[model samples]
Target: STGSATTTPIDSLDDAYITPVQIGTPAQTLNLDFDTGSSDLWVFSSETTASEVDGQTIYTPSKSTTAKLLSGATWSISYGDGSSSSGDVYTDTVSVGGLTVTGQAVESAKKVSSSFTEDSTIDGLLGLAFSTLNTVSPTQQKTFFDNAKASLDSPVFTADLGYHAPGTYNFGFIDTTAYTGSITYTAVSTKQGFWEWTSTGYAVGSGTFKSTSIDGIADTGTTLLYLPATVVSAYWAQVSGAKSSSSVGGYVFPCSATLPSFTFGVGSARIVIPGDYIDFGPISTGSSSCFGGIQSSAGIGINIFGDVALKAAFVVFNGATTPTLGFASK
Candidate 1:
């Protein structure tokens, strides 16, 4: 069945967009970050130690009659940012935006790192990447979309993220009213289990566009756009008073710095991110220092088109024989 749901920003592009998901027979609802970067539907659960629980809600499988444990099955995931979680597995009914997938493999966390435990708002992560990236042992698990695709009207989902407002995540179909202009489709290379694609080129502000082909992943879970160090350095060079700050990490610039628009090519279409949007916001509230929304991908070792870039476009993640990315102005 087709369905659409709203995603709420925890902070102004600081963390990630979270959506409520129901799991098990009685439907235990958890607020989870809908991450397209990684795969593994993991949640804080009763199995987690009380000390590790922190302020997050826990999903109790014992409360659901539909919960069935998969003996000896375990899952562990470590992110590029060093965030990690490990858990046992269960099969239960998981629902998202009115779309339900029965017997979905749900990883219930027994242990979590500080990166997860410190985040009081996010209870878990709903990975939307290809099932091949799933961390479950013995056999890989399919994502909620993959499990429900056969029953859907269309094997597609749209992420309409906003800068500081609520946005909708439409499943099974695209909402014609959500975007403007024609949707530009680009071939996705999924060798990395990500929505990886090659960009024709990029340009800073109103400067000349360069045909520097960049390979990157569209990640809803990441907060900033990460590019090659050389590219990042060149972009910041245009902004007066911009420099790499050891205190704030990455690159920082004057709060009042007048930035320029950054554009990327996708086939014949170009997605331009506004200059003001690049100034992620003050590193600290009421401070005259701001962090650059675009950072060096040197650490992550791969380019990431995160929320800062994705928010500038209406994105479509099509799960066809060869997945494709459709972009249009919001």
Candidate 2:
């Protein structure tokens, strides 16, 4: 029953990385966003009225022989960015990269916010966070990884998110060839249903590392690096002509500004994010102003080490007694 899966990035939208998955007997294939920040396997489906659904594809459970209704059950979820979805539930055989889980609860969406409906590429979200975060009513649903863990060679997965390149989400086993340098492992505290950990300190450019001890989650689903307001200001202060813009919705800097490498400490290991990655592309079409990928998590409450930070290293999301994370250069 041991198996592995690889998730490739979709084109154009660097905002979300997605992978293909199959549901039910006949295998209705859908591309899903493997979100480590959430724990609900939900999808756009036939349950949604045609008018509410834009250009996104819908999963019809009736088409799959193994699909069964999860009587009286329902699900609803809202994200930090204000995106939300609500739907009915169905039990079905779910498969990922050849790994199958019987009777997996698949939440079929009846309503989706514009944030999700506008994204025509992603068919659903595959939650990789702790099952405790699942939003099903009455009985919480288990995640695909959790359900498949028993049959895996090991209860572990690796996230290899590349910059403007194809990345992979490996299950069951780790591939040594995918990374370079020794992996630095650190203990994870998952009380909040996230791959939560603490950074001993951080350094802006070649500056001295300060012992700030930032607490945050390593979220593959998130697109930007969200730190405390003070930290974000300090980093941006190093760049000339950088300021917070209401129009930009984050810190913006001149495109010509030469940014510095930002480094975070995990125990004694220091993972440095290159300067170029901090420049998150122009603020608008043909604009000379570029938005900073690193911003303040003022409203989000906790800091988020998103794709901008995660892509700097190869990450191992270890599910152990203590649940640890291992980082190494890609």
Candidate 3:
């Protein structure tokens, strides 16, 4: 819950899927897509009157002296899911919580669809992940960490997700009060953007490294693990009675016997996911339903480690220091 100041009002919505971030009053909450794939804070604007924004936040540039619109560089993006938005850029003195940072880049969507405009409380998104990718580069470049990191007195950010309960996606700095000072280090890949490097594989409980196994790249843009088919099949076979359904794309298993607790080796560091995430139910698509957990998107290129791989450990994205990333215990 960062980047709120000036006088952005938080709205509400129904039949929408998003977490709420309240501003000013505890009751006024705005729905935000906290994406880690990029670093840009965006919100609907006064010009977006095409649809009802029930559970969103709106940005008013008139109230701030530092706000500016990228007149000629307005852009639009299309996702794999076919949703899109086009807007001009706005530079403003943005503040989240009480952590104020000047010269922050913001986007103002004048013509957003129902997906983005219908939810009154759905103001915009907070891209706090990394800086390599941005819609339109900012004049006074700002990052989510730039404003809150020093004040929180920590050096990292963490994500605590829950399928049933409210997921926690807060950021600031890493808190090591629970540190036991014991961890195995991993080497970061020299990859580009959020398409980061995945370390070579490793085993859980036991620390011996498996150099042949593929390394994993942690990504938030995707929802499931897109592993090689053979790898996914072998892993699912261990889960007793687990079977893949043609109707259920990729690996689908009934929640009977629990999945084996496994560790994903990333270079020298090992990330362990709790067993619950291993068997997420099927999420419905157009023609068929894909198993909500693991899938093998053969020949799709990049070896991506989705939410399934990320939930295991405390992931640290230290883009400010070097191109390196550090992972330690939660």
Candidate 4:
């Protein structure tokens, strides 16, 4: 009932994570981004507009013997960055790790935004958020986790992410050896489809911890850590030559500048993100200034504890009727 899958970083910047999955009978394998921030398991496929596809691996459902088109079902999803994709729905066998979910809705894209086309790292997104966020019309669809959770030994999945290393997604049970110390769990607000939770506060490097509460989602789909302007500003202030650059799009700092580690409180435990993890990469080749992995969430409305934070700890997504989030140091 339990199985583990490995995901590797797409690029040196670790901008995205990709996991291989088997779809349909003959097993059309595709590298997909496992996103806990959404609940639409949409894919790049034979139906996608030819002009919108680059060198991406497309799923040719026509070739799969088990594929069955849903008569009137379709799905559309738009993102904050304006990247959108919409397509018709079909049910087929899907496998993650070794667990299989038959009759899983596979939304094959008929149209896709240019951003998705340009980035060939992932063929599609495998959403593990809540079923409530599924965008299929006429009738909604269950997510891969939602569909497979019932038959699992335990209704939970955990993410073990690391820098310059392959990540592991373990379903049905938490692998004790993957993390250090006991897990500190916090209540999750399912009102939002995301794994939304509240952090007690944060500290810049070895500085004192603030007592404010930060509301954010642990978004695996997102690349960087996003916080309130005040929090983001406080963090950047600790490093010399760190400045907010609208020209560069976010905060940038000199490559030689020493960055302070970031720490956030969850329940009674605190998880520290290494300072090196915040160094996203230089803006250009041989450039002295580099982009930061932590950014202001003012435009995003909500704070996002994305890959930046996820890489720092072990995260468990409890998919029970009353979901909860668990965190522990590695």
Q: What is the lDDT of residue 324 in candidate 3?
A: 49
TM for candidate 2 is 0.96
Give each model a TM-score: 0.97, 0.96, 0.72, 0.98
- Badly placed stretches (over 4 Å) of model 4 are none
- Model 1, 1-330: lDDT tens digits are 887888999876545888899998788999989999988899999999778888998899999999999888999999988889998999999998999899999999999999888888999999989888999999889998889889888899889988788888888998999999999999898888999988888889888888878999999999889999988988999999999987788899998889988998888788999987787778898889888998999867789999889989999999987799999997
In candidate 2, where is summed lDDT lowest over 10 consecutive residues? 4-13
Better of 1 and 2 by TM-score: 1
lDDT of 3 by residue, 38-106 (tens): 555666766566454554556666655566665565645554335566577765555454555555566
Q: Local error of candidate 4 at 224, Å? A: 0.5
Model 4, residue 269: distance off in Å is 0.4
Model 2: lDDT equals: 0.88
For model 3, the run of ten residues with the poorest summed lDDT? 7-16
For each candidate in the order shown, give its overall lDDT on alpha carbons. Answer: 0.89, 0.88, 0.53, 0.93
Q: Show where candidate 3 strays beyond 4 Å.
A: 1-29, 52-54, 62-66, 80-82, 111-122, 137-156, 160-172, 178-185, 189-191, 202-210, 213-215, 240-248, 255-257, 282-290, 297-299
Off by over 4 Å in 2: 11-13
> How far out, in Å, is residue 46 in model 1?
1.1
- For candidate 1, list the clashing residue pairs, or say none: none
